[PDB]
Structure 1
Amino acid sequence: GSFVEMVDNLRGKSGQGYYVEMTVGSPPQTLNILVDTGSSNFAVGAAPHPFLHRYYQRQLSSTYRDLRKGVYVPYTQGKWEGELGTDLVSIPHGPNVTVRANIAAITESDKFFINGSNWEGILGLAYAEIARPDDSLEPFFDSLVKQTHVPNLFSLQLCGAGFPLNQSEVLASVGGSMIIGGIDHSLYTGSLWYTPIRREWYYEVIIVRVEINGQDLKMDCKEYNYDKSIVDSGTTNLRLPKKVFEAAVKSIKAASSTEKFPDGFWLGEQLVCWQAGTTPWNIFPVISLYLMGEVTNQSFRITILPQQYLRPVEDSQDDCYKFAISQSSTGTVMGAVIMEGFYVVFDRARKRIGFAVSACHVHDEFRTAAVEGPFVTLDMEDCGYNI
């Protein structure tokens, strides 16, 4: 329905992450926390770091409980290490509940904290299977549902501004909404379409067709989900498996061939700039991903514009962007590129993910993002990868 207390509770941007205010401990210690649907731990800075102006002080919380266990989390781009404990946690612009949750108190880290991101921890919203050290460490959302009457669902509206936000503007701007326990109808237009959650670890889905300006990429659909396809608010880009990225970039270059861009642009390294207001959106194609539907032999599609996959960056008065589609060796990742176009419903109770056109997506007067269906699609289970 309507969850006015939670609408507009996020801040941030796709390159640095979207975060929500949380409190930990007694008396409450306020921290800004990255919303990550690609991990399952609640972890906060708990020791001084050059990029943190605040951190969780366990000795100041009367409700802190030490679990006497360490946790080491190396990942591809960085790492964090900490000490496990539990404490009382609340979300000020959230459900009006306080829960006892696991917290990893980060004591050491490498390339985890981002200079100027304004966040001090991470809220992993995925399932216990991928929690560290193991699946016995109950994730935050599981605790919240177990201890309260909050429904087992959350929804995210990540709002890209469509232009660069400076240090002061990004602190003052609304970055979106995280609706805990419900769906807010003001955040989307048109209908919500649902895709099954294939398996409960990451938010895994199955892509059954890909089009660039309506032209079928025509790959075996297993390639689109090799080795998985996930929905991840903690990734900036739309990331595609190597072979799919090579085919997609060839098609996007062919569609936009009236302008030549350097190799560095297509590699997501180099910015491209145009005179203020003259970005040639129309030369870039729309991209459609068809997802397995809830009904047998039915699919639906989500369509994004270049206003989603060209990420605004500061250079001058030019309008500059980086290409936000990149290669992956770990499957498709529908990152903040995809998510900024849509309101996304993580319906854990019904094992499904819903998509609807976001009320805050960036577009122009000629094209809009879309969520449409149904389409007849056969042998969709064959699109999922095994082993």
Structure 2
Amino acid sequence: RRGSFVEMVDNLRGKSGQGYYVEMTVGSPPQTLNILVDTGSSNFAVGAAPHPFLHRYYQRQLSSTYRDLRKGVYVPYTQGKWEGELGTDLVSIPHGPNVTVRANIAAITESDKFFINGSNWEGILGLAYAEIARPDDSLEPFFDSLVKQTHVPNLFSLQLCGAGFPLNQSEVLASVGGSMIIGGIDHSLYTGSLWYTPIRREWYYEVIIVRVEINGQDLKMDCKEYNYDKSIVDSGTTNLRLPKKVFEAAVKSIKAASSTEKFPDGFWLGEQLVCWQAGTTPWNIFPVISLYLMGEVTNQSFRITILPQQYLRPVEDVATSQDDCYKFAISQSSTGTVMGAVIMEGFYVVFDRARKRIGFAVSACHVHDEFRTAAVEGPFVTLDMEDCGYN
């Protein structure tokens, strides 16, 4: 396996709790900013005014290439909001393709619970499709602009690398957090085969889950439940989020598999950390989780399997200790399944926009132990998979 995109390998930093980001520049002369990679939204937006959590921001008045679109944008969401002013400017990715494009930029002027203290990022790169752009689908997303204006192939791929232990801001700054390969697939970043699932519709990166197992035991729900009301791949969500009824069934099964140790309700609610003496985390008592995804071939599926090393998120102790501590990074959703950062950390994920498909392979940087690894395996004969999609 040769790695043919050396310029872009190791261009991400960050972690599942706070986001993975890439360096970008905006304006003339170039203003450098760290930008959250978000496959669950479709706007390119940057801090453009002082904020307690920003150490830098886009200064439109210092860019000779700034263009004012004379239009506001307001982006409320469940846990927060940002608002700002639309414009365009020249944009580059230093550890990216050697191209500069003119792109839409939302200059964030006000926000609430959007920016994250100590995360090191100052803006967001929404990589999903125009349908979910704000204020509407007429605001061309960045990746669309990049493809239209250059010879960059209509594809990107993400290797998000969890450390398997906590990092402070200093360690995050000094550590490689993964790769975003723009326009290609780098063979050094994965092992085994890539398996592809269709993009069901181009809005979010929507997929269809057809079967769920906990340690090989079928959760045995009608597969529509797994995709109620959608299933998406979202680097801008920390957890694996599951629809309420699926969450309840999965947690029951994970508790049963791990029953040799009792954990408090607050742990299963994703609120409370649990800790073990250094090196003694009992990985083996926790089950693997397999999600079967619709394949590209009629009546064929494949599965991705994650370990507790993926779904238990490393956190620092509430106290001063050498304990190894974690939070449970599976949580309930009322807006469908979200395959967030903790599940993406297991896999190299290929967003093949050109062929309307998402590829998964075992990540070369997934955390595991001597006894088990993450897996991507197939094929399986699976019938009536279209019926698993919610309408």
TM superposition score category, shorter chain reference: over 0.9
Aligned to 1:48: 50
Normalised by the length of structure 1, the TM-score is 1.00
The C-alpha deviation readout for 1:181-233, integer Å capped at 9, x for no partner, is 00000000000000000000000000000000000000000000000000000
Between the aligned partners of 2:388 and 2:102, the Cα distance in structure 1 is 40
Between the aligned partners of 1:163 and 1:250, the Cα distance in structure 2 is 26
Between the aligned partners of 2:81 and 2:220, the Cα distance in structure 1 is 38
Between the aligned partners of 1:3 and 1:91, the Cα distance in structure 2 is 14
The C-alpha deviation readout for 1:335-361, integer Å capped at 9, x for no partner, is 001100000000000000000000000
> Which ranges in structure 2 are unaligned for 5 or more consecutive residues?
none
SS at match of 2:6: coil
Aligned to 2:81: 79
Aligned to 2:361: 356
The C-alpha deviation readout for 1:11-65, integer Å capped at 9, x for no partner, is 0000000000000000000000000000000000000001101000000000000
TM-superposed CA distance for 1:364, in Å, is 0.1
SS at match of 2:131: helix
SS at match of 1:26: coil
The C-alpha deviation readout for 1:249-301, integer Å capped at 9, x for no partner, is 00000000000000000000000000000000000000000000000000000
Aligned to 2:200: 198
Q: Does 1:379 align with 2:384?
A: yes
The C-alpha deviation readout for 1:156-191, integer Å capped at 9, x for no partner, is 000000000122111100000000000000000000
Q: Is the 8 A contact 2:12 2:179 kept in 1?
A: yes
SS at match of 1:365: coil
> Which ranges in structure 1 are unaligned for 5 or more consecutive residues?
none
Between the aligned partners of 1:30 and 1:114, the Cα distance in structure 2 is 18
The C-alpha deviation readout for 1:63-99, integer Å capped at 9, x for no partner, is 0000000000001110000000000000000000000
SS at match of 1:211: strand
Between the aligned partners of 1:56 and 1:325, the Cα distance in structure 2 is 35
SS at match of 2:256: helix
TM-superposed CA distance for 1:2, in Å, is 1.0
TM-superposed CA distance for 1:366, in Å, is 0.0
Q: Is the 8 A contact 2:25 2:93 kept in 1?
A: yes
Q: Is the 8 A contact 2:242 2:336 kept in 1?
A: yes
Between the aligned partners of 1:345 and 1:287, the Cα distance in structure 2 is 21
SS at match of 2:343: helix
Between the aligned partners of 2:102 and 2:293, the Cα distance in structure 1 is 37
TM-superposed CA distance for 1:248, in Å, is 0.1
Between the aligned partners of 2:356 and 2:241, the Cα distance in structure 1 is 23
Normalised by the length of structure 2, the TM-score is 0.98
Structure 1 runs, 4 residues or longer, greater than 3 Å off: none
Q: Is the 8 A contact 2:119 2:169 kept in 1?
A: no
Between the aligned partners of 1:92 and 1:236, the Cα distance in structure 2 is 26
Between the aligned partners of 1:222 and 1:133, the Cα distance in structure 2 is 31
SS at match of 1:92: coil
TM-superposed CA distance for 1:321, in Å, is 0.2
Between the aligned partners of 1:53 and 1:266, the Cα distance in structure 2 is 35
Q: Does 1:368 align with 2:373?
A: yes
